[PDB]
Amino acid sequence: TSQELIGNCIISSIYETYFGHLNERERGDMLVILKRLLGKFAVKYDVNYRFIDYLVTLDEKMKWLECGLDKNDYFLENMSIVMNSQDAVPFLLDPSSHMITVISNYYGNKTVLLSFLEEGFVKRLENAVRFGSVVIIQDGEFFDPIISRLISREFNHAGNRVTVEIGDHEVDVSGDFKLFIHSCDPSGDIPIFLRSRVRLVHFVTNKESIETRIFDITLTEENAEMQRKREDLIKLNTEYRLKLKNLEKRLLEELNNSENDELMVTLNNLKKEAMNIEKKLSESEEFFPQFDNLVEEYSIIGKHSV
Amino acid sequence: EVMRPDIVIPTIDTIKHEKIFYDLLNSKRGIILCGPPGSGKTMIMNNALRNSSLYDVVGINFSKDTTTEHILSALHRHTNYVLTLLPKSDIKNLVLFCDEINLPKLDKYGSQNVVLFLRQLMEKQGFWKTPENKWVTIERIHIVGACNPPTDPGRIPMSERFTRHAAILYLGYPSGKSLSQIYEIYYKAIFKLVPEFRSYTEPFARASVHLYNECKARYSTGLQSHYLFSPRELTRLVRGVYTAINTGPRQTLRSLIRLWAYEAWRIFADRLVGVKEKNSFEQLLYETVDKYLPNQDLGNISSTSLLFSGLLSLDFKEVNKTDLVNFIEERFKTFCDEELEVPMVIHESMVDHILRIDRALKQVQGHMMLIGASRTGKTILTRFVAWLNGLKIVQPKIHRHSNLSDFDMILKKAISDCSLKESRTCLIIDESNILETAFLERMNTLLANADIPDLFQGEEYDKLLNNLRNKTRSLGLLLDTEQELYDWFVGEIAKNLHVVFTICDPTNNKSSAMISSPALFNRCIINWMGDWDTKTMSQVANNMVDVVPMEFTDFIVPEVNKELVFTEPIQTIRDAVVNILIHFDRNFYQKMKVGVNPRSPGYFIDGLRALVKLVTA
Amino acid sequence: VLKWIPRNLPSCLINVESSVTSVKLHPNLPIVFVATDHGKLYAFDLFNYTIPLASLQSHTKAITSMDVLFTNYTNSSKKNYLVIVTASKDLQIHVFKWVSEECKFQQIRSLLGHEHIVSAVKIWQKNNDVHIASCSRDQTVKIWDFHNGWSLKTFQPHSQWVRSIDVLGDYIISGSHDTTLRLTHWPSGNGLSVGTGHEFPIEKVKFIHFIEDSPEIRFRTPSTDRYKNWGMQYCVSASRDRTIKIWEIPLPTLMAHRAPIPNPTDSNFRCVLTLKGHLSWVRDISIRGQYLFSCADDKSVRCWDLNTGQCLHVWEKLHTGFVNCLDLDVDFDSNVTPRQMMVTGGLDCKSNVFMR
Amino acid sequence: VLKWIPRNLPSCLINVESSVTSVKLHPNLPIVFVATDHGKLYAFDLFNYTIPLASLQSHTKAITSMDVLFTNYTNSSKKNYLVIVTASKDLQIHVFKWVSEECKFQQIRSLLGHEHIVSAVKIWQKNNDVHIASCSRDQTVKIWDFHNGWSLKTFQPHSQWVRSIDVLGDYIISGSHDTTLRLTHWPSGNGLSVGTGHEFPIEKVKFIHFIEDSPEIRFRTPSTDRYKNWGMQYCVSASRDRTIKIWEIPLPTLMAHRAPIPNPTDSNFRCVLTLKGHLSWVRDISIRGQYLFSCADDKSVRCWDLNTGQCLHVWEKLHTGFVNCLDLDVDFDSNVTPRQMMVTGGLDCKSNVFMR
């Protein structure tokens, strides 16, 4: 697993930036191109790599699902791209504008809504950035160049406090502040200055996404038991891994020094957990090709639908 | 003397045209000049009028927004009303200068007004006054004009009803002999400074003329809309060579050739776009040096290898690469400590561009425009070079809810700070800061002329004159006439105001209109930031991935084709990562159908930062 | 004996892990104090320069300036010792005491009150009272009482942020980032006069004191009885325009037992002599006897003559990188012995000492 | 100048979280580097040893030995920086760069290709090239480029696992579990002569250079003109016999501009002096001045003479367990100043530092 760390890490990083504004088809095409490039220069990478399985852990995945995001894989990838950009402010492009509720659920009452069409915009924005509350901006196609410093992050380190110049007077910021931009028009004109400096993410629904959602629907309706079994076994495997790590930490802390019944019970629990892990792996090895059979079974319906 | 803009070189063509111009102007006949933008119609016009004892000169410059009030104000300064209009001089007649007659716009119903005013003046021999409705007689005031052909994007053709009453002349580009003689005179004048190389005047002039001819013949308007070479570029080349030799060290022949090559690089090929075009330019330089200056022991004439700096010493001389890089590094560290901080990485292309922008900024009335993709480091480079030279940055904070009032008040405050308070300012102009064409024509007025007369009228004009008189009495200069105060003010403004233009997407309609403006294209040096070549990307990636542990696995060197390796030949896994990222970026920008649009490299930098952070974790 | 000139090569080389900012000399024993950019403060022996005597990390950022004074107390109750203050970019200045017996730094106290980074600090004694003055980026040229530890008089002489100061008696002149100089009266705070003529930010400006016995000096000898009763005649400047200018400080409307008053017709500085030849910003200057010792960012330290006004000697390529600060010994004070040494500090993490 | 014995009381008592395996010294700054058994590499400065400056996980198994060299590039294109290389049982040879400005480690690259425990690593610099030499327990001595990272030349010089490496000039002596130590050139990789006379594995061997003007040194003066032209005469070897043998390399058949050939009659080293009177295993031997320094496993370190060869000062109760390492400053290279401070290691999770 360490022979392929450099290959698997570069694919995640290159996925966060370049592939924000693409649908499923050219995303897969560029992933094929990237894999060919990595194989050309002899840099090893995981053949069974999945972006969700590499970055989106179970806890944050459940947190995003309970907030209100759709169960589509593409929306999960875009959500992960949006909330893993510490340096570049993300751009939200969704006609449905549903994700405002998702961000409000994620940040609780700290979510404060601002719009570029307002009139008391600059005062409340500078008050919020002085407080450090999270700010979400609507109607991004009418960009106001008064926040160009916030977009470019061109602060200066005046003393021990982070210092920025917005508008006509000096304002101070704090580390807790985060900014988001939400837009509604897919064809709305965007300035190049903002476009090349923000993480442009497209929350839309294309024909390939139509095919994916139809495959999801027919999978969750025709055979719901197998999908529920897959979700249950994945969650059980994650829970078993966490329990194995906790039991290993306890066993090492109890038996690394210098035995008693507690150490023997810990060893028995570790043996049982290892046997359970082996049984779960053996069971999961006979369940993955069923999904290949299903996707070979339910693609003509996708072609008809498109 | 070559710095002064009144100096002309008499050849056969200019004296022939002066003779026939005197013949036409004596004939009580209207005169119209029409030639290419590099013909020097204004030069020959000024030389003919200002050196004749039978005629005078009046200053009128037509623009898109021009009414008869400007003409009335201009004629009021030189003429008088007795109702016959009579010039002040009773011997020398008055010649009405009207340059760029094609520049005023048509009305809402397909007609132009000021050209009909000129038609009435030179046809009905007078005009009707508006406020008192009185007829005016004119007896000895003629009208002259000089405008480009209307086939270019931005000149509106005037009707035949005006051109019927005026004679028309065509002033084509001078032949090789005339240019050779003129620049022979210029090079003898410039070599009078250093007499040790006076025998090389003819090969230098021949090389410059041949280089200009080849540059005009090779790169045309069809490839790029801003490839409008002209003899004005040769004049600017000579001026640059003079301001380089004057502030230079003891001069040798090899250093002379290097100085000429660097000046040619920074005056002729800084507007090129394609890589193969730059290769053709360097081939042209090699061929010209081989043909006309057979000198041995001459080094590389690449753009990076021609580094002339005034920063490292008291005089303009060539400096080594490593010392210049270290000096720029430490100066940029001090600048980002004192001012806004940006994680900037040092590369040779930015060194070349910072030296060329420093050369451009030190010139008198030096203005330039930057053409490059977004996040290519243009505004930060301009701020850095302005802080290096003691300039003051006046960045126009223009938002969407803005109008002409904010623009004119910003310009007025900048002009007052430049003139009254005696502080040099470096003004930046962004593409997004010019919303409507009114700002564009305001910039046209500010750059083509030396000031904006629209800003100072009425009480503003009176308080401007009062402040100018106060400053003149403060400095103890014997100036009393309003004309002396005004032209001293515009001289101070032209001496203490350098403006730069930042353009992101030149393919866009607004950028195309701005670069197609004739008043801004000729007076500003066209600098093409362009896209990053593979070497610059490789250097940036190598300097950004060195801070992270990368080699931790057994790596087998992969044998790939020569053209597939952009970094220095592969030996480590870091070079493999850099080459993979560059190949991905090129393929991705190829498959997004960007066309000939510039490619923003911010994706590369963001990917590198995310890569190093994630691999560290 | 006052016309000593360092030889063409350094006597010894001192290695410091980071960029050297400020260097000062112990006025009684050959000990060199060196500040860093990582925040460390060092101390070295001149006869044994292999390893430092002691080091101490008191600030989280770089030290900008430092000076050394050996106190003199008339009463026998107090003990004479040494005071070191290191103005640093971490918003604070600290006071240290040299321990002769243990050869170990002992921090006395720390002052506060600046709203931005401090760039220069100077110390002096008038009559059995030690005062510390500092200038910072908030334009507040502050003063302090060493025994009390409290602020006394804070004033702002300039719009842009002041950079360097110098103090003598009750008069303080200060360079600033607005390329202008200005005297300010230390007890009152009124701006007596202003100076203009440079075209770049001011780096370092210090006084030109009087001297008792000399063959002839054209820049330190007082002219008339008014100057003799005043005490200050000329001042010297060093800015980023690669020039060193010697100025004449104008007379105020002085009154006996009263504060100085500015002269409406004579409140402007007068440029006397200009110098040029440095290839970059003149970082720091020093005056001893009749010779002007100055540095630059051209990896060199130049020696200038006050009378004839040209560079008598040049020390080119003294450091791989920039040169930061120099130091000599105070010659106008009888308490301090003007020894024959001069020490430099470069940006290339090396410190050179010139002796004999 | 080169005869400064440390004092009885050690200057610093550095606390380490685990047992110390190897210690090297910075050649320009008073900063000591400590390698632990867990693989931690510590950045300790002497004047305040309570807190580590930096500590990164180099390897995961036990680090065996390390060397520190200060790079010296004759071209201004490359800025000189420190290089720290570590070897362990993890089949890895990690290389670190120490930046003094940020006082933290920075891994450059790791060298791979060995198949067993790497024992010793030494650095040496050419005019513009840097090379890394290493040896595993698989009887393989390798050559690693600093920047390329490839393996240039490998060979098998012994029939048992090797534990000692020295590279000075273009030769190498490797002491295995067998007594056999051999000299092999780099361009050819051919053994010349074999050493015998110890009844246990040889742990550490280093050469002895030609010292400068010295009054009465005995084992460093050039004996014959041909030996002086060759440039290296003597050697010092360890053993588990509680003794140290100083050897003598016979001259090989040296021919101009070609790889030389060994001598059949002179294919064996000569024993000059035996260092008897020791009480345990001798781990590390390093040489400086008139005094040869060695470390004892029996809770002590002994430094004996070179001219007369007996005790002058014996250090006891420094560490309660087995002393592992020590580092005399190299007085043999003009690029480094031989300052007066010592450092010793041990197995008691501590390291003692001597200063002056």
Ligand SMILES: Nc1ncnc2c1ncn2[C@@H]1O[C@H](COP(=O)(O)OP(=O)(O)O)[C@@H](O)[C@H]1O
């Ligand atoms: N006969 C000539 N003598 C000297 N310089 C000339 C001559 N003809 C052209 N030039 C140069 O060509 C340039 C033409 O500039 P300009 O008069 O502004 O062109 P235009 O009149 O077409 O706008 C001038 O800078 C001038 O130096």
Ligand SMILES: Nc1ncnc2c1ncn2[C@@H]1O[C@H](COP(=O)(O)OP(=O)(O)O)[C@@H](O)[C@H]1O
């Ligand atoms: N090597 C580089 N060269 C140029 N720009 C860079 C480089 N690395 C990063 N940048 C980015 O470029 C930005 C500055 O570019 P700028 O001149 O403001 O672009 P624009 O001219 O489009 O406004 C910085 O915010 C920085 O993030």
Ligand SMILES: [Mg+2]
């Ligand atoms: Mg023209």
